[PDB]
Amino acid sequence: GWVIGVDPDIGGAIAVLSPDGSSQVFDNPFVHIVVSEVIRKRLDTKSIIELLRGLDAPPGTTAYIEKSSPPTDGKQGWWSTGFSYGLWIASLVASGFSVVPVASQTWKAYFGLMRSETPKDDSRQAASILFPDKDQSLKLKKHHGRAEALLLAAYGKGLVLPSGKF
Amino acid sequence: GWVIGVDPDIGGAIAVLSPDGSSQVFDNPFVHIVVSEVIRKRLDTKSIIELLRGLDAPPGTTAYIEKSSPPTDGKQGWWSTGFSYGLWIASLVASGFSVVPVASQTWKAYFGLMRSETPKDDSRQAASILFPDKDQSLKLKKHHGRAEALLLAAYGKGLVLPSGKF
């Protein structure tokens, strides 16, 4: 009855949809790291795992995670993408959750965002239409990570946008 | 009293040194994946975790893992490197182990392999000198992953090569 959505990137989030209709979303924890004298962010492994071990989702809950691709930042931009992705899939399988990777094109096309002039903005609107109680948590432009994780869970659950304006 | 060494790559291995002097080494489990019509290998997350949960190393054992760098295969060659690395560090932290990353230059320089004409061959020799009971398991050229994992654990433990020939 539960479902999890994971935007695995820095700036991402993990969302939990419960069978009683309620939802939750948590920002991905991160630390700082200096790579070649440049300040980078890096996911916080311990905080992610402890977050997963504190969820109310029963073991076996399916986690829908975006398997993405950054090709204009190149080396150590794909290392970061694979690192964050490998970190999340391992943390989920170790917490008792089943993992289903979803292409970014797939969940965006389902919610009609594939060719959006404002993709991050529309995802927050689409996420607040599905979960109006998260409207506070989708206010800022930096909340598109929370929105993607919610849409990833909503796609995996098969939710549909109600008829109305966008 | 225990120590773990992890060559995180495909073709890598995980080694366990016990306080009674004995040692073990396991090949990294993998699956096949077709990426852009090309057959690739990819670490087996479930088999890695189950392997970690079956070790006799008590919780809190430090795991020394190589943090490496492949720059002549480029895109999706660094995604693979970060993916395997993120997969391992998450699987280790989730199994109760503490992680200490070690540069490839660091452990190679400690065992005098930094400027070796035959780096993979010498690592197997160095590993069989430290652990002669693994001589059978270091016979083939493809066993350099097992050797690296053993040397990673031997470095983290502070072992020294006895005086003698190489």
Author numbering:
A (entry chain C), B (entry chain C): 3 to 72, 74 to 169
List sentences quoted exactly from the publication behind this structure:
Recently, mutational screening analysis identified the chloroplast-localized HJ resolvase MOC1 that is essential for chloroplast nucleoid segregation in Chlamydomonas reinhardtii and Arabidopsis thaliana. MOC1 exhibits dimerization and an RNaseH fold, belonging to the retroviral integrase superfamily. Moreover, we characterize a base recognition loop (BR loop) that protrudes into the junction and disrupts the C–G base pairs at the crossover. Residue D183 from the BR loop recognizes the cytosine, determining the cytosine-dependent HJ resolution.
In this study, we determine the crystal structures of HJ-free Zea mays MOC1 (ZmMOC1), Nicotiana tabacum MOC1 (NtMOC1), and HJ-bound NtMOC1 at resolutions of 2.5 Å, 2.0 Å, and 2.5 Å, respectively. Structural alignment of NtMOC1 with ZmMOC1 revealed a similar fold with an RMSD value of 0.919 Å.
